[PDB]
């Protein structure tokens, strides 16, 4: 597994600093490559290290725009992207590679950059409430940026959850909502909660849906 | 430098049917420093095939690729419903500059689905803010195809309601649909009954979907 730090807004101007965390230690025979993804867009590589070294290569549309480094001590690569754009809003993925290879054998998580002129905030959460089966669910309206991650009961329920894509109101502000459908019989009895977490703004809501 | 080339854009195809994409590279890239990644909505890639041809760990069999020089496929012989991503190759012949290809979209077909039509009220709890969200959820159809029309008393309202699709079911191949009607409280509790009504192929006539407000 490779780790990488939490979604992030930077103003337009300023840099940018992303971890990605290798697993156990063993980061020492393979390559770290960091590729980013405009949104609806391609795969765009910036750059690769080899941490053994401390040496890097960089793609030419980043060159001294972006520096990218290890941390031999506590496994950890970062990407530094610097006079950030617009354009740069991306979620940047970290890789692994073998030096003597080259496919991208493993991938982080991802971490989305929002390069905006734009505060923190963090959303409110409501219930949708319940109409053999039924509909109930969670909206959660006006926060910034993205992403915010809904689960249900911890996760113990996954079965039947469409969680949509957010919208840009016309605020600026990110909305969506979190459905599930379960049982009509299990609703006076199975009891539902939504787990909300949007990490830009360490906001963790947990909400009961009743009718 | 080397600029990869992917064919076709978008592969709509049903299941059981074989996809087969293409890459092609604008210099060799020899016996092969090319590799095949999954996309999959809200993931990181996923690796395929490297090599041209050698198949990664956990890769179902239906995968393959095969090529050299210039050209190359990616195959799916079988398709599934599972399958729903997009697929990118990348090469990596010299270590010093990796790129990508723009990727192919791989959709799946299905038989008719209607949509399961709710309603949603806002919570008291936002309504003590001042804003009204009226939720009406078009859930698991096929095909994309829909019309969502809100209806207040029995006029139709336009210009306050978003819609956002989730992507294709993995397992299914359907679609879900929310429409959001966003007003100010005093908008709100101007009319009583709050309609949403669904057009869809799936449906012999349009469902409705109402509650008065309360």
């Known amino acids: 597994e490779l780790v990488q730090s939490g979604a992030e807004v930077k103003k337009p101007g300023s840099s940018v600093k992303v971890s990605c965390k290798a697993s156990?230690?063993?980061?020492?025979?393979?390559?770290i490559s960091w590729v980013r993804q405009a949104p609806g867009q391609g795969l765009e590589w910036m750059g690769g290290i080899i941490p053994i070294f401390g040496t890097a290569n960089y793609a030419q549309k980043f060159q001294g725009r972006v520096t990218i480094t290890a941390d031999e001590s506590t496994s950890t690569a970062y990407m530094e992207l610097s006079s950030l754009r617009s354009e740069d809003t991306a979620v940047y993925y970290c890789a692994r590679y073998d030096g003597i290879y080259g496919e991208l054998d493993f991938w982080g998580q991802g971490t989305l950059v929002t390069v905006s002129s734009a505060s923190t905030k963090g959303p409110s959460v409501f219930p949708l409430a319940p109409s053999g089966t039924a509909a109930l669910g969670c909206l959660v309206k006006d926060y910034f940026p993205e992403p915010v991650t809904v689960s249900w009961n911890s996760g113990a329920l996954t079965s039947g959850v469409h969680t949509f894509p957010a919208v840009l109101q016309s605020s600026g502000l990110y909305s969506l909502s979190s459905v599930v459908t379960v049982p009509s019989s299990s609703l006076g009895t199975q009891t539902y909660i939504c787990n909300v977490n949007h990490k830009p703004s360490n906001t963790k809501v947990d909400k009961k849906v009743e009718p | 430098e080397i600029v990869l080339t992917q064919s076709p854009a978008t592969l709509s195809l049903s299941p059981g049917e074989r996809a087969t994409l293409s890459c092609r590279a604008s210099?060799?890239?020899?016996?092969?420093?090319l590799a095949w990644y999954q996309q999959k909505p809200g993931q990181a890639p996923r690796l395929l095939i490297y090599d041209a041809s050698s198949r990664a760990t956990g890769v179902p069999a239906r995968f393959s690729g095969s090529g050299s020089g210039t050209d190359f496929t990616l195959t799916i012989s079988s398709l599934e419903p599972e399958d729903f991503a997009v697929y990118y190759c990348?090469?990596?012949?010299?270590?010093?500059?990796?790129?990508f290809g723009q990727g192919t979209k791989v959709e799946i077909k299905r038989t008719v689905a209607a949509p399961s039509v709710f309603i949603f009220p806002p919570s008291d709890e936002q309504l003590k803010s001042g804003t009204a969200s009226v939720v009406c959820l078009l859930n698991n159809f096929y095909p994309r195809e829909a019309k969502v029309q809100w209806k207040v008393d029995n006029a139709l309202q336009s210009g306050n309601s978003q819609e956002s699709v989730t992507e294709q079911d993995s397992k299914d191949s359907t679609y879900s649909l929310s429409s959001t009607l966003t007003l100010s409280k005093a908008d709100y509790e101007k009319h009583k009954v709050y309609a949403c009504e669904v057009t869809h192929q799936g449906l012999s006539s349009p469902v409705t979907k109402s509650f008065n407000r309360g």
């Open positions: 990348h090469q990596y012949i010299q270590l010093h500059s990796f790129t």
């Open positions: 156990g230690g063993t980061f020492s025979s393979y390559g």
């Open positions: 210099q060799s890239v020899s016996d092969a420093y």
